[PDB]
């Protein structure tokens, strides 16, 4: 780390649905880890971001 | 792998013709076509995707008729399926002149399977890439086949192909369970619609239009015709009611 600063998802214009899918993958198994313990599923080990450059 | 495509008659070491398997993959990208055979008929329903909301609605069909009693619906490339039905109308017509009767469904099954087979046998044509579900009613009762682009066919109690074959084969599999008896063609009209509605969650990006056709011995005088008007609206209400 070099302490990378935040630039928030709002300054990534458009592409709302993709950001919500990508947030499900990385952000929320950490946060709602209360929910992985309730539900009893396994954690995802990564999310691929592909597309045209 | 690599090799033994680039030709359409070349055997693989495994014992196959690669290019012919790649045909089936094109059929999978095509829209969902099902047939439910019934005890005194057959029902064909098809999922006709809406390119844009500028399309004229109920004026474009992937249903085509053959002779005056044999229904056909294809999944795969839209024009390839057309080309294969035109050949079929001429063949059904030659049979009809020659013998002074309409075709048997087993008769048509043989003839079509030879025309698909002919383009897998030669080096200067690309094999077909459509499945075509067809059937109708004859003396010997109702019958339903589904012809694969490989040139393979069998009878089916119920048949599905296209993007939605994953959902559709499963719904039909419940249908035999709930009715081993046959299920009337009327109640199968309402059924045909629900099957498509759940198969349209594999092509969810776009909107669809539901077109139902049928051919029934006692409620259509052996003849194929489009299901429209009140029968068609009731099926919509049925599918809408249970999906929510």
């Amino acid at each position: 780390v070099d302490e990378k600063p935040t630039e928030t998802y709002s300054d990534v214009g458009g592409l709302d649905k993709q950001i919500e899918e990508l947030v499900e993958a990385i952000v929320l198994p950490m946060k709602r880890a209360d929910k992985f313990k309730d539900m009893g599923i396994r954690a995802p080990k990564g999310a691929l971001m592909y597309g045209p450059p | 792998g690599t090799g033994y495509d680039l030709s359409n008659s070349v055997f693989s070491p495994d014992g196959r013709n690669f290019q012919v398997e790649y045909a089936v993959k094109a059929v999978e990208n095509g829209t969902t076509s099902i047939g439910i055979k019934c005890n005194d008929g057959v029902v064909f329903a098809v999922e006709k995707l809406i390119t844009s909301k500028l399309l004229v609605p109920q004026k474009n069909v992937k249903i085509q008729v053959v002779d005056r009693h044999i229904g056909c619906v294809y999944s795969g490339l839209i024009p390839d399926g057309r080309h294969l039905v035109n050949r079929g109308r001429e063949e059904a017509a030659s049979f009809k002149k020659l013998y002074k009767t309409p075709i048997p469904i087993p008769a048509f099954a043989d003839r079509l399977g030879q025309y698909v087979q002919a383009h897998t046998l030669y080096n200067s044509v690309r094999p077909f890439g459509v499945s075509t579900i067809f059937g109708g009613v004859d003396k010997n009762g109702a019958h339903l086949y589904m012809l694969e682009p490989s040139g393979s066919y069998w009878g089916y109690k119920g048949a599905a192909t296209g993007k939605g074959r994953q959902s559709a084969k499963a719904e039909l599999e419940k249908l035999v369970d709930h009715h081993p008896e046959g299920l009337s063609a009327r109640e199968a009209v309402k059924q045909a619609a629900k099957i498509i509605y759940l198969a349209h969650e594999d092509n969810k990006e776009k909107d669809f239009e539901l077109e139902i056709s049928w051919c029934s011995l006692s409620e259509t005088n052996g003849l194929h015709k489009f299901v429209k008007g009140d029968l068609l609206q009731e099926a919509i209400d049925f599918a809408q009611k249970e999906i929510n």
């Binding site: - | 495509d5 680039l6 790649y22 045909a23 909301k53 500028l54 024009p79 080096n123 690309r126």
Partner: protein, 232 residues
């Protein structure tokens, strides 16, 4: 890879023919044309190209028959074959059944013509898309032709160079031109508006616009020049 072009007779692993898609490309590179219709008329308006300013443009509407007509977009040698084929059928209908050819039956004959090149080794699927209008006994119709051979009926469509701008115009104004019937001027005017929007780095000229029309009491008529200067 891309070694599954080079043959129009080989399916790719994905189940496309690359060759037919590459035919779809050839269209975009040629000129744009717009179709739209009502229920009393079908109208085609087309951007004509020139190669230099001693050249006097190139005709992209061919009269098929007096109740049919088409525009072209893409290769011009491919266009000539199909507009000729299409005319055989219209003449046949007059000679054998004394009957105006129906747009829908026309289109499926065109479909066939295409699938003939697709199966065959040798030849190419045609490098041109046509937007076909007619007015028969069942009133006005408009079909969109493709290299694959798919004919699709539509109230309005566009193919060719930068055609999204015209399709955007069309979408917004779909219902406005459907409801207008009896006034030939308004459908003419509406198509004019669409093709303006299609353009990028150009302006309309009196010799860009070509207007083609068929109706209930309108013979096939091809307007160019000072005939599109009432409706510039």
């Amino acid at each position: 890879r891309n070694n599954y072009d080079g043959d129009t007779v080989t399916f790719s692993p994905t189940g496309r023919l690359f060759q037919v898609e590459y035919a779809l490309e050839a269209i975009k590179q040629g000129s744009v044309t717009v179709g739209l219709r009502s229920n009393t008329h079908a109208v085609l308006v087309a951007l004509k190209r020139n190669a230099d300013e001693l050249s006097s443009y190139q005709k992209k509407i061919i009269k098929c028959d007096e109740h049919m007509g088409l525009s072209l977009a893409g290769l011009a040698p491919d266009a000539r074959v199909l507009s000729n084929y299409l005319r055989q059928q219209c003449n046949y209908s007059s000679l054998v059944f004394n009957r105006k050819l129906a747009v829908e039956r026309a289109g499926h004959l065109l479909c066939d013509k295409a699938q003939k090149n697709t199966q065959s080794y040798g030849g190419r699927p045609y490098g041109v898309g046509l937007l076909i209008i007619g007015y028969d006994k069942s009133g006005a119709h408009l079909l969109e032709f493709q290299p694959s051979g798919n004919v699709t009926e539509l109230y309005g469509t566009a193919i060719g160079a930068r055609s999204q701008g015209a399709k955007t115009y069309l979408e917004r104004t779909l219902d406005t031109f459907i409801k207008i019937d009896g006034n030939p001027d308004e459908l003419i005017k509406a198509g004019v508006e669409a093709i303006s929007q299609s353009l990028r780095d150009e302006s309309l000229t009196v010799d860009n616009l070509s207007i083609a029309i068929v109706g209930k009491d309108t013979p096939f008529t091809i307007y160019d020049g000072e005939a599109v200067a009432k409706y510039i």
